A paper describes a structure:
The SID-1 family protein is a putative dsRNA channel or transporter that plays essential roles in diverse physiological processes, including systemic RNA interference, uptake and transfer of microRNA molecules, DNA and RNA autophagy, and antiviral innate immune response. The Caenorhabditis elegans SID1 gene encodes a 776-amino acid protein with a signal peptide (residues 1–17), two β-strand rich domains (BRDs), a cytoplasmic domain (CTD) located between TM1 and TM2, and a TMD with eleven transmembrane segments. Akin to the structure of hSIDT2 (26), cSID1 also adopts a dimeric assembly through an extensive dimer interface that involved both the extracellular domain (ECD) and transmembrane domain (TMD). A Zn2+-dependent catalytic center is formed by three histidine residues (H740 and H744 in TM11 and H540 in TM4), S533 in TM4, and D551 in TM5, this H3-S-D motif is highly conserved among the CREST (ACER, progesterone adipoQ receptor (PAQR) receptor, Per1, SID1, and TMEM8) superfamily.
Numbering used by the authors:
A (entry chain A), B (entry chain B): 33 to 131, 144 to 288, 295 to 343, 425 to 505, 510 to 776
Write the structure that this text describes.
Amino acid sequence: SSVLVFEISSKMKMIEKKLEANTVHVLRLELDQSFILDLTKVAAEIVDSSKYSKEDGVILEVTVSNGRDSFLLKLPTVYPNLKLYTDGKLLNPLVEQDFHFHQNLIVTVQSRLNADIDYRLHVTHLDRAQYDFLKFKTGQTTKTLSNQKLTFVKPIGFFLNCSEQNISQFHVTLYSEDDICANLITVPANESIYDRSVISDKTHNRRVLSFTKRADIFFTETEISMFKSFRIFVFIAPDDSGCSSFNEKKKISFEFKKLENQSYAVPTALMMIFLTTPCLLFLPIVINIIKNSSLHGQMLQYPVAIILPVLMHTAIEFHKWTTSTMANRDEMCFHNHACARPLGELRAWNNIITNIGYTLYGAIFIVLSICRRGSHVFGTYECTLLDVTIGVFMVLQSIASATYHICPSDVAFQFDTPCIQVICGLLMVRQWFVRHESPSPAYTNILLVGVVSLNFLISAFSKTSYVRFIIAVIHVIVVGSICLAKERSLGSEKLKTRFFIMAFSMGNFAAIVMYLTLSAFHLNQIATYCFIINCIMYLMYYGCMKVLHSERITSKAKLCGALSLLAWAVAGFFFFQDDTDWTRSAAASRALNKPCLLLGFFGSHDLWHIFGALAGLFTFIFVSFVDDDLINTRKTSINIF
Amino acid sequence: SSVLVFEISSKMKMIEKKLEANTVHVLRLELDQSFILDLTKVAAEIVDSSKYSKEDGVILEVTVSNGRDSFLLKLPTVYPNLKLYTDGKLLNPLVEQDFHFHQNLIVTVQSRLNADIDYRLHVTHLDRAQYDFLKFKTGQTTKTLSNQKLTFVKPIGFFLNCSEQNISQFHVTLYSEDDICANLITVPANESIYDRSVISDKTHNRRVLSFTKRADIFFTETEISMFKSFRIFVFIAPDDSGCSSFNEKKKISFEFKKLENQSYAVPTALMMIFLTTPCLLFLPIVINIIKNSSLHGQMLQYPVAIILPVLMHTAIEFHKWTTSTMANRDEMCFHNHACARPLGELRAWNNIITNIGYTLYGAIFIVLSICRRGSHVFGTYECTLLDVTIGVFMVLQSIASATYHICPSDVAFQFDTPCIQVICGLLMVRQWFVRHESPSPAYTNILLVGVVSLNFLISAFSKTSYVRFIIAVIHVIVVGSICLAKERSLGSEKLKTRFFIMAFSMGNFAAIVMYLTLSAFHLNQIATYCFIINCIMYLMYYGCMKVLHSERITSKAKLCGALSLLAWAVAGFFFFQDDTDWTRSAAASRALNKPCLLLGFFGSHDLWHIFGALAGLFTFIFVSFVDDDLINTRKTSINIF
Ligand SMILES: CCCCCCCC/C=C\CCCCCCCC(=O)O[C@@H](COC(=O)CCCCCCCCCCCCCCC)COP(=O)([O-])OCC[N+](C)(C)C
Ligand SMILES: CCCCCCCC/C=C\CCCCCCCC(=O)O[C@@H](COC(=O)CCCCCCCCCCCCCCC)COP(=O)([O-])OCC[N+](C)(C)C
Ligand SMILES: CC(C)CCC[C@@H](C)[C@H]1CC[C@H]2[C@@H]3CC=C4C[C@@H](O)CC[C@]4(C)[C@H]3CC[C@]12C
Ligand SMILES: CC(C)CCC[C@@H](C)[C@H]1CC[C@H]2[C@@H]3CC=C4C[C@@H](O)CC[C@]4(C)[C@H]3CC[C@]12C
Ligand SMILES: CC(C)CCC[C@@H](C)[C@H]1CC[C@H]2[C@@H]3CC=C4C[C@@H](O)CC[C@]4(C)[C@H]3CC[C@]12C
Ligand SMILES: CC(C)CCC[C@@H](C)[C@H]1CC[C@H]2[C@@H]3CC=C4C[C@@H](O)CC[C@]4(C)[C@H]3CC[C@]12C
Ligand SMILES: CC(C)CCC[C@@H](C)[C@H]1CC[C@H]2[C@@H]3CC=C4C[C@@H](O)CC[C@]4(C)[C@H]3CC[C@]12C
Ligand SMILES: CC(C)CCC[C@@H](C)[C@H]1CC[C@H]2[C@@H]3CC=C4C[C@@H](O)CC[C@]4(C)[C@H]3CC[C@]12C
Ligand SMILES: CC(C)CCC[C@@H](C)[C@H]1CC[C@H]2[C@@H]3CC=C4C[C@@H](O)CC[C@]4(C)[C@H]3CC[C@]12C
Ligand SMILES: CC(C)CCC[C@@H](C)[C@H]1CC[C@H]2[C@@H]3CC=C4C[C@@H](O)CC[C@]4(C)[C@H]3CC[C@]12C
Ligand SMILES: [Zn+2]
Ligand SMILES: [Zn+2]
């Protein structure tokens, strides 16, 4: 007797049986040709689980197999928080080639306990119109499934065949209104979501994406070429592990898109045209002077190690991106997929190509500074090398930001806007030293070390509850030191020094009060905002000093100052829309849903890139032009401030 | 009829049966109390597999279960290279708590083919004296198993219970003489080597180590505290995937050690005593002069960004080490485990603490240079800031090498000996400029950029077959440029310039010939050897120039030069023993078996650290002392070379 064979009718949805001690139940269901493409779920439940609360390990084992696919159920399934005494798994359906020939569904029940167990078997079939949904007609590139129910007892599965449907690139988006944790699972059609193929695998081809409100997966050309067929599953997650008592019903809307390679010619051309016409301010003055007109002692003492942090970070990020599998790239990278336009394997090509303004303006800065060089009695001190450094850091900002947008994740060094802080500090150094000497680029050494150290410190303490107090202390110390240096350099000449100190203290204290007690300022924005505000304040102080020392600001310099102020404000408005936070769960990071503002290509972050580049350009032009009224004044009669 | 039940005797080892089309075989074996702790293997074989060469997917499915554990067999199992029609898996044995009560072993056979299949079942029991071997008596800390057979049909498994055996720290070593690929697998005793627990796991607690000649796993205190029980398996690997036709027999010897926390007081004290007594050369001269005896203008223009590459690499490595699981740390890190002494979670504490000589000597360099400062008419030009830079890079070398030995892997930047190259270049700069001016530390900028770029370039092209030609081209270009600079600076004064150029060309060409056509020079050593050799050649040239210009080298400086030459040679001899190569397989990297040379604590690499630090110290002292015969000579009458 130990082995008991039962015959189960197809109509049966629920089976209740008692497993006598040391006995095995074998249940058979015959499958005809009506079971083709029928995705079946079999679940097992232990009746009266309270009696087995003192037993460790597996209390019931169930095996399910239809001949083509199989899995094992081990009850209870244990989770970090809970223990479930009911669980089930999906069986890959039989195909038309499988079919008086018939197929069998076999269920085996075993236990290690020397006591009778009551148990329940649930055989549920999924909606065969959510399976095989992914079939595209001629001229059809998008399909939508709206208001689909998701339950712990009824998951959702799709079959995708790219070879048969003529698909080279595929995108999938899920939308939900509730905050119920779910999972999006993808495997190649010949892989199992439950088992390992062999015991040495170390192959990562399975995607597991926890989500609440939004999930995105992109099948690139390379991945489709490798595998050609995929299965997609959605499950209710029993434990809110990657997101933050069940019986929830969760509604999900799907969006499936076939994609082709796209050359975003119109948006790129419009961006280049918009970025180019600002450069016409360089033509009438800087270039015309060039038209009208030891190097090794500065080439080997120029600080070139300032480029090392960005270049090493770029090498590290490229190494991390290239060795990752296709499946892991959708798990580890976080984009704003509502405004992400792909190009090849790159998920957000807009966020990368919109950094070209920094590259264009940095090279222009370098070339113009080198050419404009060339006298020692009249005018302010020239600033060739530090302007070259400002251009170099513009180029470094373009490289660092483009590298960041390949795969935005939580790493040791964020590196999306530190070069902007360096640029602001360098402009402050320029205006601080231009009337005493030729400004040196070793203040770049000190500034870069400070900026990178602050970036790392903010990153390391972000999870804690006192990181902003550390930032406020460092901010206070830096501003106090700068005020002390101003005092010592100029002396306590009432009008000049005292108002500078008071205004800088008030502005920085207002900022400190703001980001300490607002919570609308994210950690990734505080340092950049502080550097920009301090740079603008110092430039305004320099201009007011020029005015009240009875000097004249040229109308060209007033125009450039106004344009710089406007561009900085617009860039800051678009920067405020960032909303990036690595302290929340992956599902919360995936819930970002801001669409592209312009031409379906440009979003808030893309515009922040372009307008930050413009603000940098206009500020550079303003500081280049502001002291052009003193070109014939003698260096000994030039006022000092 | 479709379900057929068979009763199988315990004596049966082989079963041959025909699976008629659309039929299911259920085989039962009753288990008495004699099956306690009996690790059982069940394998399935498809007879005449040639008939199913045109069929895709799974042709036979087998489920095995003893009530407590279960698995699934799907035939054929496919591998990157081969397809196996015979495969089996291990079943976790029944325990004493499981036991007229009896247990059952159940085997189910199914197929999707509408044709009869012949198949064979093999039920093999493993050696129950290799299972439960890990039981330690009182006063016993090591156990050894010698000459154990490993076959594709008979794997090896061990059960480890740390709670019952009173184990806080455990080490396992495997030795083999043949090059047959195998796998070492470890899981917590409540985890499966075959299945995922739930479908959202992303938990890495399973170790898979490919090996040929040696494998090591270390159970730290933290891991044992989390899990308390583990199962260890060895398998023949069907495909030589992580290593480089079967029926091989592979012999393996095991070594199991209980470990306790150790304070290596005697070796550390001896190392500190050995490192300290060299410093007595500083006492009679440099410190006695201090006893007998703008800063902000150099503090803000000092290049501090030179510390950024090492500090950022250290932050990245610490982030990578801390977020890794216990299981992954044994998979991703490669030590010389024959000479690795643990401390806490650190696998090789000797390789980390032996870098303290660099830290001790760099701080001494900095302090002595700062204090010895302080005149402008007599003697050679003083070198305070560049000596401070040399000390700073000594400290950076200690940090970088200690960080490297936490987890030696194949990363973008190796960073075990670039700071040594920087130190050699800085000494060359010191001797190049000391008789013309005070040497500047911006040559550090150019030198550091070059060194880091060369390191990255060697790393990126290591897999290719022409990396050494790229290195040779860069070497030729650098040496030619240096010779040209020497010519231009000194002029073609026959005796001085021509012999310098000829000797440097000959030495560097000999080196280039060597590492191009020897293959005993590894990629990771070429640049370091070149920098050391060029530094020594330039110091010898400087000394010979002093001698042939009728100047005198003090006996103290001759002693320091001799000690520097001896220490560099000893350090190079120990450096030659490195044998690190990231182009080979992981098994080949794990086959390293060099034991500790001294006190069971110091190996070749540990001695390379100490003697490289000594060589640096002696070279620094020599260049500090060599021009002490010119202290009263006037700067205008000092010879130039
Ligand atoms: C470890 C964690 C990170 C730590 C660092 C974190 C911060 C990193 C940032 C910066 C690090 C460096 C800042 C400067 C340091 C003081 C230098 C100084 O005052 O002396 C110089 C002043 O020269 C200037 O002040 C020039 C302009 C500097 C602007 C750079 C900071 C911008 C403020 C950012 C806003 C706040 C930051 C936002 C915070 C959220 C020279 O003085 P002197 O006496 O004229 O020179 C002698 C010559 N003389 C006597 C003949 C004239
Ligand atoms: C992209 C891939 C990596 C590329 C970089 C890879 C290499 C990176 C390494 C180094 C990069 C920098 C090297 C120096 C470059 C030339 C500088 C020069 O000649 O001019 C200076 C010479 O001054 C010296 O030569 C000082 C000593 C320099 C030693 C540093 C290199 C050691 C050789 C390593 C052995 C070979 C390397 C081993 C290869 C396996 C100054 O010249 P001057 O004219 O006196 O100054 C003007 C003032 N005066 C006219 C008034 C006097
Ligand atoms: C020169 C200035 C404006 C900056 C460089 C921008 C130009 C040269 C870049 C930016 C966008 C680029 C294109 C982006 C997309 C396409 C389509 C596809 O086939 C890949 C390459 C191709 C054809 C690129 C060619 C080069 C390209 C046009
Ligand atoms: C400087 C300002 C005024 C204009 C600069 C010209 C820019 C906008 C031009 C120069 C080269 C051009 C590209 C040349 C080639 C490609 C690839 C092609 O498959 C689609 C068009 C596309 C993508 C063009 C886009 C526009 C482009 C980038
Ligand atoms: C921030 C940078 C880029 C822009 C600088 C803009 C310059 C041109 C602006 C900004 C602040 C301005 C000053 C603000 C207030 C006053 C007081 C009053 O007496 C009128 C002139 C005067 C003194 C302004 C002169 C022009 C001024 C200095
Ligand atoms: C020249 C710049 C850098 C200095 C001042 C920055 C200004 C322009 C920025 C910084 C903070 C920004 C504000 C932050 C919050 C709000 C509230 C909400 O309605 C969104 C926009 C709005 C109203 C922003 C408008 C622009 C803003 C005021
Ligand atoms: C001061 C100079 C010589 C360098 C510093 C070396 C000394 C201070 C270091 C190096 C080795 C270190 C010890 C290494 C091992 C032990 C045993 C264990 O309980 C952890 C800490 C402890 C107790 C450390 C204490 C500090 C220690 C003794
Ligand atoms: C400078 C030379 C001459 C001697 C320097 C003294 C060194 C060797 C001394 C100073 C502090 C000492 C350590 C102090 C504390 C510890 C932890 C203890 O559990 C074992 C001994 C151990 C690990 C000592 C090892 C030797 C030690 C590192
Ligand atoms: C490499 C550094 C650290 C050590 C330098 C060692 C010095 C003291 C050594 C190394 C090479 C030596 C020279 C080698 C050969 C000769 C030729 C002959 O006429 C004797 C003296 C003379 C000229 C030696 C003088 C001392 C010398 C300059
Ligand atoms: C002062 C230093 C840096 C310059 C010269 C380095 C010398 C001392 C080093 C570099 C290469 C080394 C040799 C490399 C290979 C061999 C062959 C084998 O039997 C091991 C040791 C031996 C014999 C080494 C002895 C020491 C050695 C000759
Ligand atoms: Zn950005
Ligand atoms: Zn080392």
